[PDB]
Symmetry: D3
Subunit: 32 residues, 6 copies
Amino acid sequence: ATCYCRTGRCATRESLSGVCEISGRLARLCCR
Amino acid sequence: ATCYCRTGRCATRESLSGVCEISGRLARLCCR
Amino acid sequence: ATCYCRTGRCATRESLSGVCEISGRLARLCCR
Amino acid sequence: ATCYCRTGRCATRESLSGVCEISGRLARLCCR
Amino acid sequence: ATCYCRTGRCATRESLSGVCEISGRLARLCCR
Amino acid sequence: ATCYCRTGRCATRESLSGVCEISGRLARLCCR
Ligand SMILES: [Ca+2]
Ligand SMILES: [Ca+2]
Ligand SMILES: [Cl-]
Ligand SMILES: [Cl-]
Ligand SMILES: [Cl-]
Ligand SMILES: [Cl-]
Ligand SMILES: [Cl-]
Ligand SMILES: [Cl-]
Ligand SMILES: [Cl-]
Ligand SMILES: [Cl-]
Ligand SMILES: [Cl-]
Ligand SMILES: [Cl-]
Ligand SMILES: [Cl-]
Ligand SMILES: [Cl-]
């Protein structure tokens, strides 16, 4: 899948699919 | 990025980049 | 705080504040 | 529910109900 | 270290040191 | 079990058994 680690909400075509980190803080894994 | 939720270790060209789930069980997020 | 374990995105006045579970599956913790 | 991000164990009226963060470190989410 | 995935609070000589799973459900990792 | 918070892959003797933290970053919990 195509995934991004997001500070904001996932894109419309993406789904919250797990957890990643941004500077040691839990972030959204958004995949499609 | 291109990522996969994995039952085994990440491929040689992938890196463990977060946490996902397979059937409600914690799994490796592997991204190339 | 007042928080909920959500299947969908956090409400307008809520913020994604952590990780909880619904039936053993990762879910958004949303707090107002 | 009523939840707090705790450094110590949950109160007797509270139950550990998820994971939150305190300065990028994992902490107990205690809810009642 | 010597650690256990626990359904209850960590023992008095143990410390909550991470997150594990019991039957796909989040649980305290308690380490001596 | 015998567990360690790992930056690299788990030893072949060990199994990835959950999540811990190394300086506020998610690390492999490797147990045996
Ligand atoms: Ca789970
Ligand atoms: Ca962290
Ligand atoms: Cl983003
Ligand atoms: Cl979603
Ligand atoms: Cl998150
Ligand atoms: Cl796999
Ligand atoms: Cl998690
Ligand atoms: Cl909801
Ligand atoms: Cl506290
Ligand atoms: Cl925790
Ligand atoms: Cl226990
Ligand atoms: Cl926990
Ligand atoms: Cl054992
Ligand atoms: Cl290591």
